[PDB]
Amino acid sequence: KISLQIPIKLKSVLVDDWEYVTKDKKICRLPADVTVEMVLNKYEHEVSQELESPGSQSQLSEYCAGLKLYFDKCLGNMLLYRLERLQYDELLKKSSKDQKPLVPIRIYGAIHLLRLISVLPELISSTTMDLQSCQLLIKQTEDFLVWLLMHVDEYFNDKDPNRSDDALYVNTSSQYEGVALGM
Amino acid sequence: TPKISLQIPIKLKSVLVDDWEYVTKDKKICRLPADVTVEMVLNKYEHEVSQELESPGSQSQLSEYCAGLKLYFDKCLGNMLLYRLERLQYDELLKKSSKDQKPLVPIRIYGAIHLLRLISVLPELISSTTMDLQSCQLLIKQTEDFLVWLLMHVDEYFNDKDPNRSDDALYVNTSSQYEGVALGM
């Protein structure tokens, strides 16, 4: 079995997100203002100047590229609640209409990256990796988590969709809830 | 916990270096008792500031910090405040007070130069303790404004006017006693 340590502030962020998409009937505002690509690019471009040895930089770049590929391939499969699959279908439709394939890393924000991170240990323990490689992945993810906790005040604000504007969440109508959940 | 720094004026640092160079080379030591002890000094201070701060929290803090510096100064005298030389003055007067049927409280003898000594000892004494950021910050700010007021009145007690008179300049030269038992006779 594998174990990952997540700061309790990000755990409360995840529980808040679970409360919203569930009995508050909110979805996320897409396309996000800060997407997964932007977060990972800023992280890598800020950390690559930190340590000098080339091996650290190679490992960092490989981890970021793999995280991008894996989020792309995993988002629709396992990372969406049941209310948010109608949104996924509408995005897929309006993408296929414009002859362009959907690329989820340029649309979805940091809360879905946090979902992927939190669910990573079970996906790791379900494969047949080494043990050195599992612990290397867990180390890289814990470093990313502490970096992200340092910036948590920049990506995870609370702004009340019902009050002013431009919060990270939006309210759903009864037609969306009728076709999404009760269909 | 933290690495704290206390902005002390350089002129009083010069006065402190002068204190140590008066007590080191020609080794003139301060007089016991002083003009008016640190009890009277802190009483003067609290008499000045208490009548000009409005809110009750500020004045509670001022009273608490003055009392605290009073007791901390009386305790830490013989451990880290006075030098190796006047240790003999300290121990002889301590045996005197032990014969005097009640223990000595140093708040009744010493003076302001020892208060300056404790003020300069305070920063690393705080930095070596596990007190939190806001608490140690409040403390160092309190002591900062305190020695600023000290700067307001360096004339009354720290500058030795009429230095030729022995009773007015609190620095007294030792006899053969401490010149001997200081460096090992």
């Binding site: - | 640092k13 140590w20 208490s50 701060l53 929290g57 004045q59 880290m80 000594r117 690393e124 403390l139």
Partner: protein
């Protein structure tokens, strides 16, 4: 097993006529204690410095440590700001007054060495509200005096 004794009085790190603990290796002078003890008034039996007293009093348990420091800071609830500094001296060891290096970095006209020598080159709330309101009354009268100063200059 008997340890070795350090020949230097760590209060000033200088040698002379001194005595040492039974469990602690470093020694100190007679008059360097608090209270400073006479060269002949030696204590009855085994005497330790602050360190071994600390050790056999704490029972090497952090639980007892925080327990007595907690009821200590609760004892000094009137001076609570200084309580953490106060608790350290009852277990710390004396050493001669040496201001840290952070101070004397201003003047090159002083020289020092390893010698340590210097060379020239409740009713409390009622009283607080008392003070609060008397000062605010003071300042409101002096502020109507402020505006009256302005008016008297306006009498020009």
């Amino acid at each position: 097993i008997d340890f070795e004794n350090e020949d230097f009085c760590s209060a000033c790190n200088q040698s002379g006529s001194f005595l040492c603990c039974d469990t602690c290796p470093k020694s100190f002078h007679f008059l360097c204690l608090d209270p400073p003890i006479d060269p002949n008034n030696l204590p009855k039996g085994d005497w330790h410095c602050n360190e071994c007293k600390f050790k056999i009093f704490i029972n090497n348990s952090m639980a007892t440590l925080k327990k007595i420091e907690s009821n200590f800071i609760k004892q000094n609830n009137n001076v609570k700001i200084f309580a953490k500094l106060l608790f350290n001296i009852d277990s710390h060891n004396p050493k001669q007054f040496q201001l840290p290096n952070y101070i004397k970095e201003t003047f090159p006209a002083v020289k020092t060495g390893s010698r340590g020598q210097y060379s020239d080159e409740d009713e409390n709330s009622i009283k607080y509200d008392f003070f609060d309101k008397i000062y605010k009354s003071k300042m409101v009268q002096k502020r109507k005096l402020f505006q009256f100063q302005e008016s008297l200059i306006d009498k020009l």
